[PDB]
Amino acid sequence: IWGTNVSIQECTTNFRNFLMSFKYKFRKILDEREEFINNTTDEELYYIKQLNEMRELGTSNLNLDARNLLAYKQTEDLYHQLLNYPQEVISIMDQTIKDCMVSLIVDNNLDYDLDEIETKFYKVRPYNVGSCKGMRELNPNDIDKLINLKGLVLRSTPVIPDMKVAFFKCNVCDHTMAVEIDRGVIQEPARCERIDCNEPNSMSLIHNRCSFADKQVIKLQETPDFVPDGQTPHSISLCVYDELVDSCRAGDRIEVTGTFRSIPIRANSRQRVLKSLYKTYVDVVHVKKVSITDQDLAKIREVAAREDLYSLLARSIAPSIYELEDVKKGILLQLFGGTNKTFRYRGDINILLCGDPSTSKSQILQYVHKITPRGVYTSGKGSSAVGLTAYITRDVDTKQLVLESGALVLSDGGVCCIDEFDKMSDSTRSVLHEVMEQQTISIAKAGIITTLNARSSILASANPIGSRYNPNLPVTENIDLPPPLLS
């Protein structure tokens, strides 16, 4: 390895002898774990079992852990070089994985296509590289060094195709050859490879006949529980290649491991002048989301055969709320709903929770929201989290006419628990009329005319007018809601 005085051969041998003959017992004794009595889960060859699992499942990536290098004896310098020289280390680890798997195929006589195994690219994903480094403490000596980060992703750009293998065509003799691309440079041939033609400058790139990889820049955000209370959390830009693409949607919280790398940026596109600020990103190599069963069927039969199933479910709906026996019963029935008869018939339960302002009017709302699979908690008066209705937005970025669906839609089958149902606007009250009556939301705006299937369940909870509900006065005179909406 250049700039390290480290031989690749010794590293490959170290990782090779680490692959087999290694047992999880070494890891169990590395961390001074008291419960090292286990034999099958510790003394067995963990990595050999993993390789067998890859062979019988045909997978590529490996969820290698960093501590396992410390557990073994000869792979301590290997671990330190992995932390210091992640690129070459990861490349040689992948090559060693491929060679070890083909050697295992050769040795165990488990017949398989050697060419198929050789063609497939096998990856390694070293996670738990070290302590949870802070985003704000990324001093510039961590360049090209493995970094562990924690945060919640803000957004994610679509797939960005990056060229891997070029494809030129001789525009005078129709000769085509592929030139591999290294470090994003085009090493176009000087002349035609065919000697009978050998025409210089006769090569034109055929863009759609090239080979492309997947790149997905992800804007990671510092987690709120670790940012200083004064300033707003900072952000860093991830980079995801050839895999793990769309493996972390916006809003997820993940622990990402990658090499902290910086690249120059061109001050002027036409010229080669480069800004001296070196925008930084990280090349992700593993993402872990820090955030159906026959036995399950048996459990369903066990709970269903119980005589007190109805009361048990009523209690489990809102365990922390006392009394409210019939309310929990109605909510439970709403969760199931009627049969979706077809030939339209709603086949769904809509429940409104009135009365004087109730903390449960909110607590049981969050409880049912957590219970229901689909649906989303939403406030009618505020609608800050979700607009509660489908309307066209100009997303600013590219300023395109993107149609974003409201809270009602996206909750088909689920329960769209509304809050502050009394204080919602009249315009969205009409949308509620439409969704509960027609079951669909129709939009005609900016040249887009369409009907969106809602098929949602409404569980609203509206506080009354005045200090508290008046039982003597009728519900209409207290809730401030149109009678057609209440019926």
Partner: protein, 647 residues
């Protein structure tokens, strides 16, 4: 052509004097700077703070024995950028060898050193290569002269006088000056490249390129001797592993409102902190930044576009902030002074009366701790008051003493995104997030729109504000204690009218307030006289009419909260009983009274009672929650409820 001029500075003599100073200076271990360089060689320190007081002392000492100096302090305050290089060169010459077993696990620079040295040596026998900045692992700064109080500072020592951004004229460019002002906008840390480490695909030779221009052009031409003589015309590839990077942060210092001449507008001045000074400046700072005021050039094309008009920045060198012994002191004050009746009057010494409101403000300042949920340890109070009553003065007094406290008005919170077009920053805060571990003093609470109504509602029962700008759904932690100062509409409060009718706040928001005080003024014969005497005495003597104990320091409250926060006073079972019968009888009397419906005791009143009792014990040692605490808490709650029924 370039003319020639005669300047009496003699850089060579100055360099010799500099070397003598770095070798032969020992402050009243060996030499101080040799010890510092020894620490640097041990990789335990990477900041050579070249003090100017030391250089002045060195000059004064050698003045009595030969005057072997040329006024270095007056020679680097006139041109500091060159003397940074001179000091670095002198340090490289006198750099001691390490005297410790430093681990060299990450020795990429040393590996390049030995590799290139061996490659050069295998042909040198025929059987500087390294840029000076590349080998350096230290950053060199200047500490400005302190106060002289002598004839030496005869208007000299421009780094001693803290200037303002307006007084930084164009003739100070290149000098080592210091400015005083408030930081407003500090950028994120970016790696600024100092020298690139291009490597050639063939010829094996790597060529470095020093750069300080904010923009450069890659070489991409193997001009090495072997490559040129073989005419291989190899291309160069960057190697960030072998390159040298320095952390770069671009702050921006404004000027205080007291330094702005009448009718003018505050100016600003870009600051370029780099090296080990990074992350030492934050937007909520008032600092005396010392740096070299330098003309950043518009190098490129807008260069010819503009002309001689340069842009300036301050290369910061030294930042000086302005802004169990204490435990023993506050314990002794507890023994001597009665905190309950003393801190209350200490909050607003210049505000006469309203003592119980001040007592409640103490509970808000301390606040109970009930983080475990199943809840919250934030106390919120609203002062409906009356126009002409010093609610705003109380809010300002709370803000100026409460750590992480902010003051704001309803009409001018929330948040704004991407305010500057150029940098395009993300998720700028507001007013509630700033007082994260503090208090927000929302004056004019009634005159505050629906958007801020929803924002404060979210903050109040979530302790975290969120936005939905572009579907990001990001959120900002704002666990701020809320202190509102709404005032009645139609001017003066009407006691006859119902309290919620007098102020345009929905009962849903007000009912969630832990404690509420209606504190309106009444024309009397004696209270007004004492108030007038107090105010007029304040006008004469510029100081409060001290008539009782008036503690000033707020660190006692900080000690109390930090002390009892870990303690978390556990409530007694008898306490829980007495409060359950307290709720029973409170609800009973609420019914039997129903006059204004703004009272029906609600689970939230119980939670407020619990948190007030927790705060009271949190002020008094640990686990003091007993009948004594709950009696005072319920007395305060009942008094606050009665305040709504005053007169």
């Amino acid at each position: 052509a370039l003319p020639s001029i005669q300047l009496p500075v003699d850089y060579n003599n100055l360099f010799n004097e500099i070397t003598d100073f770095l070798v032969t200076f020992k402050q009243d271990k060996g030499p101080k700077y040799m010890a510092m360089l020894q620490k640097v060689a041990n990789r335990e320190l990477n900041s050579v703070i070249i003090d100017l007081d030391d250089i002045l002392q060195y000059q004064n000492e050698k003045f009595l024995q030969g005057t072997q100096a040329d006024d270095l302090v007056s020679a680097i305050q006139q041109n500091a950028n060159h003397f940074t290089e001179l000091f670095c060169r002198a340090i490289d010459n006198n750099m001691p060898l390490p005297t410790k077993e430093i681990d060299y696990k990450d020795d990429v620079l040393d590996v390049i050193l030995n590799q290139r040295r061996l490659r050069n040596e295998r042909m040198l026998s025929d059987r500087e290569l390294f840029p000076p900045n590349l080998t350096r692992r230290y950053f060199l700064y200047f500490k400005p002269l302190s106060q002289n109080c002598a004839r030496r500072y005869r208007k000299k020592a421009i780094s001693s006088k803290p200037l303002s951004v307006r007084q930084i004229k164009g003739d100070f460019l290149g000098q080592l000056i210091t400015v005083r002002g408030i930081i407003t906008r500090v950028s994120d840390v970016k790696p600024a490249v100092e020298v690139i480490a291009y490597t050639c695909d063939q010829c094996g030779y790597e060529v470095f390129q020093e750069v300080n221009s904010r923009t450069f052009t890659p070489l991409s031409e193997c001009t090495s001797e072997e490559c040129s003589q073989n005419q291989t015309k190899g291309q160069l590839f960057m190697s960030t592993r072998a390159s040298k990077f320095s952390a770069f942060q671009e702050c921006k210092i404004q000027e205080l409102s007291q330094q702005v001449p009448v009718g003018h507008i505050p100016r600003s001045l870009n600051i370029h902190v780099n090296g080990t000074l990074v992350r030492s400046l934050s937007p909520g700072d008032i600092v005396d930044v010392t740096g070299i005021f330098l003309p950043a050039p518009y190098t490129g094309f807008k260069a010819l576009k503009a002309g001689l008009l340069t842009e300036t920045y301050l290369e910061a060198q030294f930042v000086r902030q302005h802004k169990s012994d204490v435990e023993e002191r506050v314990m002794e004050l507890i023994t001597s002074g009665d905190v309950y009746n003393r801190l209350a009057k200490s909050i607003a010494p210049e505000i006469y009366g309203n003592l119980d409101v001040k007592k409640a403000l103490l509970l808000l300042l301390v606040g109970g701790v009930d983080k475990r949920v199943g809840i919250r340890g934030d106390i919120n109070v609203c002062l409906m008051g009356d126009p002409g009553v010093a609610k705003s003065q109380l809010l300002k007094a709370i803000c100026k003493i409460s750590p992480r406290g902010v003051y704001t008005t309803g009409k001018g919170t929330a948040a704004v995104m991407k305010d500057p077009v150029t940098d395009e920053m993300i998720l700028e805060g507001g007013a509630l997030v700033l007082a994260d571990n503090g208090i927000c003093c929302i004056d004019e609470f009634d005159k505050m729109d629906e958007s801020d109504r929803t924002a404060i509602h979210e903050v109040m029962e979530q302790q975290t504000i969120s936005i939905s700008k572009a579907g990001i759904n990001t959120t900002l932690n704002a666990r701020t204690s809320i202190l509102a100062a709404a005032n009645p509409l139609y001017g003066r409060y009407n006691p006859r009218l119902s309290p919620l009718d007098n102020i345009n706040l929905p009962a849903a928001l007000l009912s969630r307030f832990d404690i509420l005080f209606l504190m309106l003024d009444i024309p009397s014969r004696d209270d007004d006289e004492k108030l007038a005497e107090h105010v007029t005495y304040v006008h004469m003597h510029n100081k409060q009419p001290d008539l009782d104990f008036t503690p000033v320091e707020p660190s006692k409250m900080r000690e109390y909260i930090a002390y009892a926060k870990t303690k978390r006073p556990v409530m007694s079972e008898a306490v829980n009983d007495y409060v359950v019968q307290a709720y029973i009888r409170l609800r009973q009397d609420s019914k039997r009274e129903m006059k204004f419906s703004f009272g029906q005791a609600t689970p939230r009143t119980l939670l407020g009672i619990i948190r007030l009792s927790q705060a009271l014990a949190k002020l008094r040692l640990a686990d003091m929650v007993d009948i004594d605490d709950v009696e005072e808490a319920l007395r305060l709650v009942r008094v606050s409820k009665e305040s709504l029924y005053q007169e």
